[PDB]
Ligand binder design. Sequence first.
Ligand code: HEM
Ligand code: OH
Length: 154
Amino acid sequence: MVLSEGEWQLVLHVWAKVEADVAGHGQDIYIRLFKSHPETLEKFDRFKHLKTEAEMKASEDLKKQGVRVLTALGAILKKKGHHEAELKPLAQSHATKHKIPIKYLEFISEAIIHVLHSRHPGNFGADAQGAMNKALELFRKDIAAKYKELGYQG
Ligand code: HEM
Ligand SMILES: [O-]
């Protein structure tokens, strides 16, 4: 699905708030993901031992990974759909090495939306959330197509 420029601006206006503290947002998103869908934590060899939210919050390595995820996603969002180059390395590692199903990308998308909804009411009202969902649906659609090209059912 193709986003309008207005939709992209709603996406980028809340992403600007994430960027005040990408590390803190990444921690909240990972905690939400692992709490809501615990099976996703099992895909992380370095983090699957974490037992509680306190341990997740105290993990410097998890914090760094959160920053990587959100910075990679931010670069994709800033391309406003013209993210072919950015999806190549990401799809390859996630399909072949990490083996992350599309359903798990749906789960992290849900966690992103949940955290933006709680933190950023000023920039994440209904229309803004709809635009972000559209952007994440586009991301997942295009990643799923790349997964298939790479040989992974997803
Ligand atoms: C918005 C969706 C996501 C983005 C933008 C993203 C981005 C990244 C990036 C940039 C890296 C480091 C480089 C690489 O290996 O590709 C990474 C690593 C990884 N990703 Fe993702 N990721 C996403 C979703 C997920 C999900 C949902 C899972 C599992 C449920 C996952 C599992 C992993 C694992 C296991 C690693 C290796 C982590 C480590 O260094 O210990 N990713 N991801
Ligand atoms: O990730």
